[PDB]
Amino acid sequence: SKLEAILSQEVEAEIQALLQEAEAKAEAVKREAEEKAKALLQARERALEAQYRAALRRAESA
Amino acid sequence: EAEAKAKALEAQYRERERAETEALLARYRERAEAEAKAVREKAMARLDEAVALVLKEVLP
Protein backbone atom coordinates (compact mmCIF):
# COMPACT_ATOMS: atom_id res chain seq x y z
CA SER A 1 0.00 0.00 0.00
CA LYS A 2 1.20 3.49 -0.84
CA LEU A 3 0.07 4.86 2.50
CA GLU A 4 1.82 1.89 4.12
CA ALA A 5 5.01 3.09 2.38
CA ILE A 6 4.27 6.57 3.77
CA LEU A 7 4.00 4.92 7.18
CA SER A 8 7.41 3.39 6.43
CA GLN A 9 8.89 6.81 5.66
CA GLU A 10 7.46 8.04 8.96
CA VAL A 11 9.07 5.06 10.69
CA GLU A 12 12.41 5.75 8.97
CA ALA A 13 12.08 9.39 10.06
CA GLU A 14 11.68 8.11 13.61
CA ILE A 15 14.73 5.83 13.16
CA GLN A 16 16.80 8.78 11.90
CA ALA A 17 15.69 11.01 14.80
CA LEU A 18 16.13 8.17 17.33
CA LEU A 19 19.74 7.46 16.34
CA GLN A 20 20.34 11.23 16.44
CA GLU A 21 18.88 11.39 19.96
CA ALA A 22 20.80 8.28 21.05
CA GLU A 23 24.11 9.83 20.04
CA ALA A 24 23.00 13.12 21.64
CA LYS A 25 22.30 11.58 25.04
CA ALA A 26 25.44 9.39 24.96
CA GLU A 27 27.46 12.48 23.98
CA ALA A 28 26.11 14.39 26.99
CA VAL A 29 27.02 11.39 29.20
CA LYS A 30 30.65 11.09 28.01
CA ARG A 31 30.99 14.89 28.13
CA GLU A 32 29.85 15.55 31.70
CA ALA A 33 31.59 12.47 33.10
CA GLU A 34 34.89 13.58 31.55
CA GLU A 35 34.59 17.17 32.85
CA LYS A 36 33.79 15.84 36.35
CA ALA A 37 36.92 13.73 36.07
CA LYS A 38 38.19 17.19 35.16
CA ALA A 39 37.69 19.66 37.99
CA LEU A 40 37.86 16.59 40.35
CA LEU A 41 41.45 15.80 39.36
CA GLN A 42 42.25 19.45 40.05
CA ALA A 43 40.56 19.46 43.46
CA ARG A 44 42.57 16.36 44.45
CA GLU A 45 45.84 17.94 43.34
CA ARG A 46 45.33 21.24 45.16
CA ALA A 47 44.22 19.40 48.30
CA LEU A 48 47.26 17.12 48.43
CA GLU A 49 49.60 20.02 47.64
CA ALA A 50 47.95 22.00 50.46
CA GLN A 51 48.41 19.05 52.79
CA TYR A 52 52.09 18.88 51.89
CA ARG A 53 52.19 22.66 52.54
CA ALA A 54 50.83 21.95 56.01
CA ALA A 55 53.67 19.45 56.42
CA LEU A 56 56.14 22.16 55.27
CA ARG A 57 54.98 24.91 57.62
CA ARG A 58 54.28 22.76 60.66
CA ALA A 59 57.46 20.71 60.59
CA GLU A 60 59.66 23.76 60.02
CA SER A 61 57.99 25.66 62.87
CA ALA A 62 58.33 22.70 65.20
CA GLU B 1 41.25 6.04 35.38
CA ALA B 2 40.13 8.46 38.12
CA GLU B 3 40.68 5.98 40.97
CA ALA B 4 43.99 4.79 39.47
CA LYS B 5 45.32 8.36 39.23
CA ALA B 6 44.11 9.10 42.77
CA LYS B 7 45.85 6.02 44.20
CA ALA B 8 49.26 6.55 42.57
CA LEU B 9 49.03 10.32 43.16
CA GLU B 10 48.55 9.75 46.88
CA ALA B 11 51.49 7.31 46.88
CA GLN B 12 53.87 9.86 45.36
CA TYR B 13 52.99 12.87 47.44
CA ARG B 14 52.81 11.04 50.77
CA GLU B 15 56.32 9.73 50.12
CA ARG B 16 57.35 13.33 49.50
CA GLU B 17 55.65 14.23 52.82
CA ARG B 18 57.81 11.86 54.87
CA ALA B 19 60.93 12.89 52.92
CA GLU B 20 60.19 16.50 53.87
CA THR B 21 59.58 15.82 57.55
CA GLU B 22 62.92 14.09 58.08
CA ALA B 23 64.69 16.55 55.74
CA LEU B 24 63.81 19.43 58.00
CA LEU B 25 63.81 17.66 61.40
CA ALA B 26 67.38 16.34 61.37
CA ARG B 27 68.75 19.54 59.85
CA TYR B 28 67.21 21.58 62.61
CA ARG B 29 68.75 19.10 65.05
CA GLU B 30 72.25 19.74 63.71
CA ARG B 31 71.79 23.50 63.58
CA ALA B 32 70.36 23.58 67.12
CA GLU B 33 73.39 21.70 68.40
CA ALA B 34 75.70 24.04 66.51
CA GLU B 35 73.99 27.06 68.04
CA ALA B 36 74.01 25.49 71.52
CA LYS B 37 77.75 24.96 71.34
CA ALA B 38 78.04 28.46 69.84
CA VAL B 39 76.19 30.18 72.68
CA ARG B 40 78.07 28.13 75.27
CA GLU B 41 81.32 28.94 73.44
CA LYS B 42 80.72 32.68 73.35
CA ALA B 43 79.60 32.48 76.97
CA MET B 44 82.70 30.55 78.10
CA ALA B 45 84.98 33.43 77.20
CA ARG B 46 83.86 35.92 79.85
CA LEU B 47 82.34 33.74 82.61
CA ASP B 48 84.79 34.97 85.25
CA GLU B 49 85.14 38.49 83.93
CA ALA B 50 81.46 38.87 84.80
CA VAL B 51 81.27 37.03 88.13
CA ALA B 52 84.27 38.93 89.48
CA LEU B 53 82.66 42.31 88.85
CA VAL B 54 79.24 41.29 90.07
CA LEU B 55 80.59 39.73 93.25
CA LYS B 56 82.31 43.07 93.61
CA GLU B 57 78.92 44.72 93.10
CA VAL B 58 77.06 42.58 95.65
CA LEU B 59 79.64 42.99 98.41
CA PRO B 60 79.25 46.13 100.60
Side-chain angles (χ1 to χ4, degrees):
Chain A
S1 174
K2 182 184 75 173
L3 182 52
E4 183 177 6
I6 299 303
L7 288 154
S8 184
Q9 81 172 356
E10 285 170 348
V11 169
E12 288 173 350
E14 287 293 328
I15 295 157
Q16 176 183 357
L18 192 145
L19 60 89
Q20 288 177 358
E21 288 174 353
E23 182 63 31
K25 60 176 183 283
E27 180 172 3
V29 168
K30 65 181 76 172
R31 186 177 180 274
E32 65 189 359
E34 200 279 332
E35 285 107 25
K36 291 293 107 181
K38 192 177 179 182
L40 187 60
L41 192 157
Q42 303 172 359
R44 177 182 65 248
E45 186 181 2
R46 58 96 184 271
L48 189 50
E49 195 275 334
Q51 186 169 357
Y52 183 79
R53 286 181 187 270
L56 290 169
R57 302 289 178 89
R58 270 71 176 269
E60 72 183 1
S61 66
Chain B
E1 286 163 346
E3 61 191 357
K5 287 175 72 68
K7 185 176 180 180
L9 202 285
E10 284 186 353
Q12 182 172 357
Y13 291 94
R14 288 180 290 106
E15 185 64 31
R16 188 170 302 279
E17 186 274 338
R18 188 262 176 189
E20 182 265 331
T21 188
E22 189 274 333
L24 276 70
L25 181 144
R27 295 187 184 177
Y28 290 178
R29 293 293 188 273
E30 55 85 20
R31 190 184 62 247
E33 293 298 322
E35 302 298 330
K37 289 176 70 176
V39 65
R40 197 274 307 146
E41 177 176 357
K42 189 189 289 188
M44 190 257 171
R46 199 172 296 113
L47 77 153
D48 205 84
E49 196 272 321
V51 74
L53 196 149
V54 305
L55 187 273
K56 185 259 184 182
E57 190 269 328
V58 170
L59 287 179

